[PDB]
Amino acid sequence: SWQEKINAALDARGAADALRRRYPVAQGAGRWLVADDRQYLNFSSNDYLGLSHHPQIIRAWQQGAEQFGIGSGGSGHVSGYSVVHQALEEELAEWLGYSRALLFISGFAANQAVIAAMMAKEDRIAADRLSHASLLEAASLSPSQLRRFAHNDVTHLARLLASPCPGQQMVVTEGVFSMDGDSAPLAEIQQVTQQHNGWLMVDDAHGTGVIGEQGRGSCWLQKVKPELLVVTFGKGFGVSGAAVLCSSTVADYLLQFARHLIYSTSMPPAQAQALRASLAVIRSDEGDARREKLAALITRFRAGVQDLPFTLADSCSAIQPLIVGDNSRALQLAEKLRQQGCWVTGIRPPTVPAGIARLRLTLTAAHEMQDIDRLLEVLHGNG
Ligand SMILES: *Cc1c(COP(=O)(O)O)cnc(C)c1O
């Protein structure tokens, strides 16, 4: 029956331990986290540049409501395509060096929309084994064939691409990977993709706004232009939403065949104004100051772990894995940190293999050096 199907599934998830439970917060973005009315240093949010609380972005969101009301009133294909949406798209395309940008209500929707629209049963997706679930889920449901290459292994990628394919091939990777914060070798990946006549799709959720000139992200920094670039605004941008960057004809195509685009309500124009505001901060001298402050905090953090009984990742970004090893020690550590006013998130098997449990820390430009020093002190020992 249905209920038994439900029940058994929750039971298998329990047995694998794997149970998830949301905790409500009064504040969850930026330097602080407030839970159960207690203040904590927040090392668990994706607000990498501290923009969620930025007064210019807050005011754009507020004035945009005065000017446009709240809901757009419809899809972008009927009465919901605002002059603010259009301006935001044009400013994103110009920023990142593409012909067109298309807005989406979430990065998860944009990824899923692109793949559903572009990939046919004859085609192949070659995706990094560690790609975001939205990408892999979508690639899996797709009628097209899905092959994974070992993480960042371009030799393995070239072999996948070289295998006979009845249709077209799309390579997919991240500019900065979600789990370990490492970067993909985009220039070599792009070379072998072109060698096999494929196209490249890069998801730069963790790179966008945070690295490269004017924060343009991983592709710009590495002087690669993939055919498809997906940027999401729920992280560094400090808001929510996403864009697909692409050529004129691919944009026209998505406008015809991406159903998330055709049959979904567009975002509130006041959300779009906050995103334009966010983009303007990111591109500005203050954007540069925030990125350099983030880099300074990361340096301070990685230096201080050198004396600690833990290990770091190959990450130069806001994502800073602290590898602990054992799942009980990792859980203990995070619980001790919490008692001591530092809110962290532990990642343990099975999400990661056997003996690699960890805290996945995230730093932000809203933090201060004394916050890193407090984290380091508690990691050391004191309470
Ligand atoms: C967060 C995440 C997204 C999902 O974007 P949302 O706007 O949060 O839906 C896509 N890709 C990567 C690599 C991400 O980490």
- CATH number given to 56-283: 3.40.640.10
Q: Are 103 and 242 in contact (CB under 8 A)?
A: yes
Output the residue whose Cα is nearest ligand 1's atom 5: 107
- CATH number given to 24-55+284-382: 3.90.1150.10
Pocket flag, ligand 1, residue 227 (CB < 6 Å): no
**Which atom of ligand 1 is the closest one to the Cα of 106?**
7
Catalytic positions, please? 46, 132, 174, 178, 203, 206, 235
**What residues pair up with 347 in beta bridges, in sequence order?**
358
Pocket flag, ligand 1, residue 360 (CB < 6 Å): no
Task: Determine the distance from the C-alpha atom of residue 296 to the mean position of all C-alpha atoms in its chain, rounded to a whole number.
Answer: 22
Q: Are 102 and 254 in contact (CB under 8 A)?
A: yes
Residues of the chain with CATH 3.90.1150.10: 24-55+284-382
Pocket flag, ligand 1, residue 108 (CB < 6 Å): yes
| Residue with tokens 């949406």, as numbered in its chain | 85
For residues 260 and 107, give the distance between their C-alpha atoms in angstroms, rounded to a whole number. Answer: 11
Distance, CA 108 to ligand 1 centroid (Å)? 6
Resolution value in angstroms: 1.7
Measure the CA angle with vertex 29, ends 105 and 91; round to 5°.
45
Q: Are 216 and 96 in contact (CB under 8 A)?
A: yes
Provide φ and ψ at 142, rounded to 5°.
Answer: -40, 145
SS (H, E, C) the chain: CHHHHHHHHHHHHHHCCCCCCCCCCCECCCCEEEECCEEEEECCCCCCCCHHHCHHHHHHHHHHHHHHCCCCCCECCCCCCCHHHHHHHHHHHHHHCCCEEEEECCHHHHHHHHHHHHCCCCCEEEEECCCCHHHHHHHHHCCCEEEEECCCCHHHHHHHHHCCCCCCEEEEEECECCCCCCECCHHHHHHHHHHCCCEEEEECCCCCCCCCHHHCCHHHHHCCCCCEEEEECCCCCCCCCEEEEECHHHHHHHHHHCHHHHCCECCCHHHHHHHHHHHHHHCCHHHHHHHHHHHHHHHHHHHHHCCCCCEECCCCCCEEEEEEECHHHHHHHHHHHHHCCEECCEECCCCCCCCCEEEEEECCCCCCHHHHHHHHHHHHCCC
Residues of the chain with CATH 3.40.640.10: 56-283
Nearby residues of 215 by Cβ (< 8 Å), 6 or more positions away: 49, 208, 209, 236, 282, 283, 287, 291
For residues 26 and 39, give the distance between their C-alpha atoms in angstroms, rounded to a whole number. Answer: 10
196 is in an annotated binding site: no
The sign of the dihedral angle between the CA atoms of 46, 130, 156, 139 is: negative
